[PDB]
Amino acid sequence: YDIFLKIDGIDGESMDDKHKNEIEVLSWRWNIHVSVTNLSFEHYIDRASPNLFKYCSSGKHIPQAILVMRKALEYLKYTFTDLIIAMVSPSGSQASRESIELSFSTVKQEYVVQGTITAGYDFKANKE
Amino acid sequence: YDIFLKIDGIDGESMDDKHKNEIEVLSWRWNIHVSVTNLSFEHYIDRASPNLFKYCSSGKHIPQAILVMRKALEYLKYTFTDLIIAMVSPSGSQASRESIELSFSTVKQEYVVGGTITAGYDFKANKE
Amino acid sequence: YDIFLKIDGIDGESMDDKHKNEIEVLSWRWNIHVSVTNLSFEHYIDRASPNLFKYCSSGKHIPQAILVMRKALEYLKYTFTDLIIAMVSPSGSQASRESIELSFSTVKQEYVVQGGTITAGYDFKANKE
Amino acid sequence: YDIFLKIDGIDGESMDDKHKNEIEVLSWRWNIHVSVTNLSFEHYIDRASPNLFKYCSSGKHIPQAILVMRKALEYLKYTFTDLIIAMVSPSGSQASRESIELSFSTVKQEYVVGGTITAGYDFKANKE
Amino acid sequence: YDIFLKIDGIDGESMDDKHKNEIEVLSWRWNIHVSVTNLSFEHYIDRASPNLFKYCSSGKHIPQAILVMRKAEYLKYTFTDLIIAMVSPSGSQASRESIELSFSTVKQEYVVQGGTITAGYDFKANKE
Amino acid sequence: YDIFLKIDGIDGESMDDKHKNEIEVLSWRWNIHVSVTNLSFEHYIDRASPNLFKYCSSGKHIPQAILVMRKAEYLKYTFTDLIIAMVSPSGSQASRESIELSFSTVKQEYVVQNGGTITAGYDFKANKE
């Protein structure tokens, strides 16, 4: 049950075959209330954290960003764009974890089945 | 125990005999106060998730919804008309749950026990 | 230890001796905030549920409903006159519950010590005993 | 660790000897700020619950009540004067509880050790 | 660990060789939000409880009270100008009473194993 | 899991060999929103709580504080123009003590263990890096 994430520019510490230097996500969350909530995710403190801090503190948009979930072979593809790192929130104690909120224009949701059933949408412009 | 629900259009991931391709449901909840509440429920991120995205994000209306409970033979059925996905919240950590809302108009409340006992109502049109 | 509620028309499922087809309550609370709180209680999903939904939806008057507590042997009895169903809050999970609130105007508390009875009553609409 | 509460007219159920027909308390509390808080306490549902409901329903002043903490032997006293029944919340679920609030105009504290340390106060009208 | 407290006026029940007749303090917390919260400590209901009532009821000024934590005496806390505001006895079948006091100065003296570090401030006088 | 914090003038009590008179930090956090949270860390009540007391109440400008994490020197943060907001001892029968810090600028320094180091910082009070 592994989660991964890719950002243009940013480069993670991940080390699997089909994709190296991804970000290793621990938990991902977001909602659709029509309005969209920011994407919230948590990871270790790792090599992206400086980049993350930076992207955030720079407001630099992000051409793409891709979330993936696979059970211990993947099956779930979350595809966000035009992305602005809202907040980075380090924290630690004697772990060190790191939550982030991001602000995206659109998202495509891919769900691969033993085929697929896809779904996306633009929020800055209400088109399927 | 065994909770299953149908949405016209939305198929689920059911492998069951008296209904396959139905949404396996984990929790459900709805209040009345007389303004009825959005119905909430929480399934695995499964094959309905992308369409639940859509019906939500389309704000499209649904012909019929039917909720079924039974034990570990179906005892409890809930039936609903003009359905509008109010909210959809997918999330995951290393469950992957998705907590959904639904605005509706009528509800039918059957229950196999005399045989059955049923009471309905329409909350837009105030009638039976 | 054992609670049974009895409402007019609306019928529980229970197969007791000293009651029958009565509502099997799993929890109740009520308060006197002189203001009176509504009563709430939570039973399984049982034959009374559409009735309560009906009576909640209709808002139709009920003459009375009666709650009784009992060991595990009666011992505690509440009587309430005049009743309107306010909130029904069913739910379920692969743990089927059903909250019910409801508004009344009078309460009679009947306590039967293990010897006599101690009773107290009131009317809230018309301040009276 | 026994707690017994004596209030005229309202009878508890205490099997004890140095005070029978006494409200077996299970929990209590009160502040001073300098408008005192109420007094909250909690007993099983008992013969006192009818006497405490009516007395709440009527709201009839109660002259004097006495509060006792003992050890598993009487060591702690409180004396409250001018007392009104404000709230009563019997819960039940297959403890069998009923919490109370009351309002005093004057409270006494008394505490035995090798001496006994005593103090009271009137609050409706401020004086010692 | 141990925590003892000695108040001008109020006699305790702790038996320590260096300082019997102090308050055996259970907990305590305080800040400088410059704005100072109250001291807020905790103790079993003991001989000090009536006098604290008296002071809390009578609002009488307390020149000084002194705070000690030692292991199972690194911390010495000094406060002056003290008044009793909250007092909250509460029982059940722990017999507790929390208190909050208002202090104009504090002197925080930390011993080291060595000597002491020393820290004091007049919030009212904004000096030291 | 070893977290140390070097503050200038506020001496420490930390018995480690790459650095002594260091603070033993228990837990820390902070949040960007641009707009930054204060710094937040916890420690026991130790030699620094008097030093940290004054720096708070007297509000003296801290040049710099340096925070490090390392496993049972891989993460560094540098904060400058610092002032102690609030001090908070407590304890009972752990003596805990949390403190909060307000920096003008922060650096962030992650050495990667085997090839490189990724770094990031910023001046907020003059919206610059």
Side-chain angles (χ1 to χ4, degrees), chain A residues 1-14 16-17 19 22-30 32 35-53 55-59 61-86 88-96 98-104 106-116 118-126 128, chain B residues 1-14 16-17 19 22-30 32 35-53 55-59 61-86 88-104 106-116 118-126 128, chain C residues 1-14 16-17 19 23-32 35-53 55-59 61-86 88-96 98-104 106-117 119-127 129, chain D residues 1-14 16-17 19 22-30 32 35-53 55-59 61-86 88-96 98-104 106-116 118-126 128, chain E residues 2-17 19 22-32 35-53 55-59 61-85 87-95 97-103 105-116 118-126 128, chain F residues 1-14 16-17 19 22-30 32 35-53 55-59 61-85 87-95 97-103 105-117 119-127 129:
Chain A
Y1 36 75
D2 322 288
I3 310 115
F4 312 109
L5 173 56
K6 245 177 85 183
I7 301 184
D8 279 5
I10 299 189
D11 186 69
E13 183 178 2
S14 190
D16 289 345
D17 289 345
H19 60 285
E22 320 268 309
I23 310 185
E24 191 193 3
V25 192
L26 312 172
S27 95
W28 66 272
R29 293 182 183 174
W30 58 277
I32 309 177
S35 192
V36 65
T37 198
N38 308 307
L39 170 53
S40 311
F41 74 109
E42 184 131 20
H43 65 126
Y44 286 144
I45 307 189
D46 48 31
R47 197 194 312 217
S49 309
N51 287 321
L52 266 170
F53 181 92
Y55 262 9
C56 183
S57 38
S58 72
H61 290 265
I62 296 179
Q64 268 205 338
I66 304 151
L67 200 161
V68 165
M69 183 176 282
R70 84 187 209 217
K71 174 130 171 167
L73 185 60
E74 45 250 61
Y75 61 86
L76 178 49
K77 174 167 183 165
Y78 284 112
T79 319
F80 296 159
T81 58
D82 225 20
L83 253 179
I84 321 99
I85 318 307
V88 54
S89 284
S91 80
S93 82
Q94 186 173 355
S96 54
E98 252 209 315
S99 198
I100 308 91
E101 292 227 291
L102 319 190
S103 57
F104 59 102
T106 89
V107 55
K108 167 195 169 284
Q109 180 189 341
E110 174 173 328
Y111 175 95
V112 315
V113 59
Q114 287 78 272
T116 88
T118 320
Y121 185 90
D122 180 315
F123 288 82
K124 272 114 177 144
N126 301 342
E128 166 206 9
Chain B
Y1 288 172
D2 289 328
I3 325 192
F4 328 88
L5 154 100
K6 183 178 179 180
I7 293 166
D8 268 326
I10 291 180
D11 264 342
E13 233 160 281
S14 154
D16 194 15
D17 44 3
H19 53 294
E22 333 302 351
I23 296 188
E24 170 144 331
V25 184
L26 327 162
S27 91
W28 57 264
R29 69 187 208 265
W30 52 285
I32 316 173
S35 282
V36 65
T37 189
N38 263 333
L39 163 81
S40 322
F41 87 109
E42 160 161 278
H43 70 116
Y44 279 128
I45 295 197
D46 54 22
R47 185 207 280 234
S49 314
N51 296 333
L52 282 153
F53 180 115
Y55 280 176
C56 159
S57 89
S58 58
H61 300 222
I62 297 166
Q64 202 193 58
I66 297 183
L67 213 176
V68 169
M69 262 206 55
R70 79 161 205 246
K71 261 68 178 205
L73 293 319
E74 315 165 276
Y75 89 101
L76 200 176
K77 261 157 193 296
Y78 275 146
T79 309
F80 314 90
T81 62
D82 184 49
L83 301 121
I84 322 158
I85 321 280
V88 64
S89 301
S91 81
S93 74
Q94 32 181 50
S96 61
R97 75 272 284 271
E98 202 185 3
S99 210
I100 304 169
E101 291 249 309
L102 262 177
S103 40
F104 59 119
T106 68
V107 53
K108 289 184 191 176
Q109 192 181 347
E110 189 212 272
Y111 171 20
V112 314
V113 82
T116 77
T118 294
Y121 194 82
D122 186 310
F123 277 73
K124 186 173 186 179
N126 298 27
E128 182 209 322
Chain C
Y1 291 63
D2 284 322
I3 316 160
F4 320 116
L5 162 71
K6 177 198 84 172
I7 309 194
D8 305 273
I10 303 135
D11 61 356
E13 203 178 334
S14 196
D16 184 1
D17 54 331
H19 221 167
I23 300 184
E24 165 164 324
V25 189
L26 318 168
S27 90
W28 59 272
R29 305 199 165 171
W30 65 269
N31 168 97
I32 302 308
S35 191
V36 64
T37 296
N38 292 292
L39 173 89
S40 278
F41 83 100
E42 198 156 353
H43 63 300
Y44 299 124
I45 288 175
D46 43 37
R47 223 199 264 207
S49 300
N51 279 173
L52 305 174
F53 171 67
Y55 269 76
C56 186
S57 48
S58 71
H61 271 101
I62 313 183
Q64 74 178 353
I66 316 181
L67 189 140
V68 154
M69 286 225 65
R70 143 171 176 192
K71 252 271 198 80
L73 291 182
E74 177 243 332
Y75 93 79
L76 173 56
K77 191 205 294 198
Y78 291 87
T79 288
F80 314 107
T81 74
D82 166 70
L83 260 169
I84 322 159
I85 319 291
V88 52
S89 311
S91 63
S93 71
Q94 49 152 84
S96 83
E98 195 196 325
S99 297
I100 286 96
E101 326 200 352
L102 42 70
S103 63
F104 51 75
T106 74
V107 52
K108 209 187 92 204
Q109 216 190 54
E110 184 122 31
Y111 181 101
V112 286
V113 53
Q114 310 217 84
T117 88
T119 56
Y122 211 76
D123 177 283
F124 306 121
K125 179 184 183 176
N127 255 351
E129 172 199 352
Chain D
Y1 299 93
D2 314 81
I3 313 169
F4 296 121
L5 162 71
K6 206 167 81 177
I7 319 190
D8 322 290
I10 314 160
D11 273 348
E13 214 172 276
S14 154
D16 196 70
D17 41 19
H19 42 275
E22 279 270 37
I23 298 187
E24 159 179 320
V25 196
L26 317 175
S27 83
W28 67 264
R29 63 137 209 261
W30 51 276
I32 295 189
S35 305
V36 77
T37 173
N38 265 345
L39 165 61
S40 294
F41 80 93
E42 209 147 320
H43 60 285
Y44 301 98
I45 294 179
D46 52 20
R47 147 207 279 251
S49 317
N51 281 307
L52 283 163
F53 161 61
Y55 264 126
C56 195
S57 77
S58 58
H61 289 228
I62 291 180
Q64 161 196 113
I66 304 186
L67 205 185
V68 177
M69 256 284 330
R70 302 199 282 189
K71 274 186 174 64
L73 291 303
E74 31 258 60
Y75 100 94
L76 173 62
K77 172 134 308 183
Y78 302 100
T79 292
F80 314 89
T81 314
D82 184 61
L83 259 176
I84 314 95
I85 322 280
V88 52
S89 293
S91 149
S93 53
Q94 53 166 65
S96 94
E98 175 203 37
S99 203
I100 300 99
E101 293 193 33
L102 309 183
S103 55
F104 47 103
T106 85
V107 50
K108 177 179 138 187
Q109 163 143 50
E110 148 199 339
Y111 177 50
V112 313
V113 48
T116 89
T118 302
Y121 198 93
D122 185 295
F123 292 74
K124 183 178 179 180
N126 319 274
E128 160 169 42
Chain E
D2 303 333
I3 309 184
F4 325 92
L5 180 69
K6 193 210 87 160
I7 306 186
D8 310 342
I10 305 153
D11 305 330
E13 197 187 307
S14 42
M15 274 190 289
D16 193 44
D17 42 359
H19 47 228
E22 281 184 328
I23 305 171
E24 205 176 313
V25 163
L26 297 180
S27 94
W28 60 269
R29 56 174 182 278
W30 74 273
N31 273 50
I32 303 182
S35 194
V36 79
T37 77
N38 278 348
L39 181 61
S40 317
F41 72 75
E42 223 79 1
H43 74 116
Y44 281 114
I45 314 183
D46 44 37
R47 302 185 177 174
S49 294
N51 287 187
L52 295 152
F53 188 114
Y55 272 91
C56 177
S57 60
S58 50
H61 266 97
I62 289 174
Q64 193 190 79
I66 303 152
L67 190 150
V68 158
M69 287 202 64
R70 79 141 166 275
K71 259 161 197 237
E73 283 188 346
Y74 46 79
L75 198 32
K76 210 134 145 172
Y77 269 79
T78 330
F79 316 77
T80 38
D81 189 37
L82 281 150
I83 294 169
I84 329 299
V87 63
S88 273
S90 94
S92 53
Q93 61 184 45
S95 60
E97 167 204 1
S98 190
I99 309 165
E100 307 212 352
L101 320 192
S102 49
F103 60 118
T105 299
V106 51
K107 215 172 61 210
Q108 170 200 13
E109 159 180 307
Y110 176 76
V111 314
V112 48
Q113 332 171 101
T116 89
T118 325
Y121 206 84
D122 192 331
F123 290 80
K124 293 179 179 179
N126 294 56
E128 195 143 312
Chain F
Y1 303 111
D2 300 321
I3 302 97
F4 319 86
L5 180 82
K6 169 171 81 184
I7 310 192
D8 304 319
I10 293 140
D11 299 346
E13 203 173 306
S14 175
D16 198 35
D17 56 353
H19 40 267
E22 303 277 350
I23 313 184
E24 175 188 8
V25 166
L26 306 201
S27 78
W28 61 274
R29 65 204 214 246
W30 56 276
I32 313 192
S35 281
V36 65
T37 188
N38 262 354
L39 190 55
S40 308
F41 86 96
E42 171 110 325
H43 66 100
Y44 289 99
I45 313 172
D46 54 25
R47 189 205 277 258
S49 301
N51 262 16
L52 282 152
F53 179 98
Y55 260 80
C56 165
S57 29
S58 94
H61 259 95
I62 287 192
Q64 178 210 67
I66 296 181
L67 193 181
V68 176
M69 296 203 48
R70 37 149 311 203
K71 314 190 166 80
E73 281 259 291
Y74 84 132
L75 168 72
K76 298 201 181 167
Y77 303 116
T78 295
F79 316 97
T80 325
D81 171 75
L82 285 150
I83 313 88
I84 315 287
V87 71
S88 181
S90 65
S92 46
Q93 290 163 29
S95 64
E97 167 173 299
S98 182
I99 299 204
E100 251 163 51
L101 256 197
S102 69
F103 41 78
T105 46
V106 46
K107 203 151 68 219
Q108 176 209 351
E109 190 148 340
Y110 175 73
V111 314
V112 69
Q113 298 217 20
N114 61 25
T117 76
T119 54
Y122 187 76
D123 179 315
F124 295 77
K125 281 54 187 69
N127 280 331
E129 155 179 359

